[PDB]
């Protein structure tokens, strides 16, 4: 069986009720990234930033937020491939886990975890953060998580699939190139062509809820 590495971004959770970064501006939930997505922003106004992520963490756990068909198809893909499958997400949501995937690598961290900044230890956390703990979230200028295991998987992959990610943020946006260097077949699945879509050998566009189960089904049937 082929070794398959899947990278996901915010687009796979859009249809689950988690709104995406509007490209038109530089704003996330009507906030500038510099203010809520950098270490500097956290230092200048810790209580705004803590409130911002407290809000994201609560919204994540609302009843109307659930895995969609795309999350489910990736759980089925892992079921079929076992240890020849690796899922890497830029998302801080837990929808991959709720769908049934395991050993999900959250290269940009998790909303349901916080970090005691003196230690390096991440702690489970589902409620608000009050009065120093910080969100276990990778901000701009900080090193993504799990990169050693990710780059190893990139060099070993037979198929690399990028789903729901716009190709603006590195190093994740560079994964397709790395995969191609080590011979992987590359696939982009997205609502619209990404900033790096030209690097991919194969591509399908449309809502993830439709495009991803369609591709996964075609992949699984090609196995047997």
């Amino acid at each position: 069986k082929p070794r398959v590495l899947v990278l996901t971004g915010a687009g796979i959770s859009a249809e689950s009720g988690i709104r995406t970064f509007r490209a038109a501006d530089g704003l996330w939930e009507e906030h500038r990234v510099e203010d809520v997505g950098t270490p500097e922003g956290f230092d200048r106004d810790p209580e705004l930033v803590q409130a911002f992520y407290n809000a994201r963490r609560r919204q994540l756990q609302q009843p109307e937020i659930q895995p969609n068909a795309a999350h489910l198809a990736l759980a089925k893909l892992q079921d079929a491939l076992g240890d020849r499958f690796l899922l890497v997400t830029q998302n801080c949501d837990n929808l991959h886990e709720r769908a049934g995937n395991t050993n999900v690598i959250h290269m940009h961290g998790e909303l349901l975890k916080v970090r005691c900044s003196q230690s390096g230890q991440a702690l489970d956390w589902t409620g608000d953060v009050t009065p120093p703990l910080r969100p276990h979230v990778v901000w701009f200028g900080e090193m993504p998580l799990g990169m050693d295991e990710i780059y190893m998987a990139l060099s070993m992959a037979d198929i690399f699939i990028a789903i729901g990610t716009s190709g603006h943020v590195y190093p994740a946006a560079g994964f397709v190139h790395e995969a191609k260097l080590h011979g992987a077949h590359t696939v982009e699945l997205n609502l619209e062509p990404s900033q790096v879509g030209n690097e991919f050998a194969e591509k399908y566009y449309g809502p993830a809820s439709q495009v991803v189960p369609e591709f996964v089904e075609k992949l699984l049937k090609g196995l047997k």
């Binding site: 990234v33 940009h108 990778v138 901000w139 701009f140 200028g141 900080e142 090193m143 993504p144 990169m147 780059y151 190709g167 603006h168 943020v169 590195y170 190093p171 946006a173 900033q195």
Partner: peptide, 9 residues
């Protein structure tokens, strides 16, 4: 690799 970074500086 490198740190998390956006395509525009």
């Amino acid at each position: 690799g490198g740190a998390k970074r956006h395509r525009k500086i």
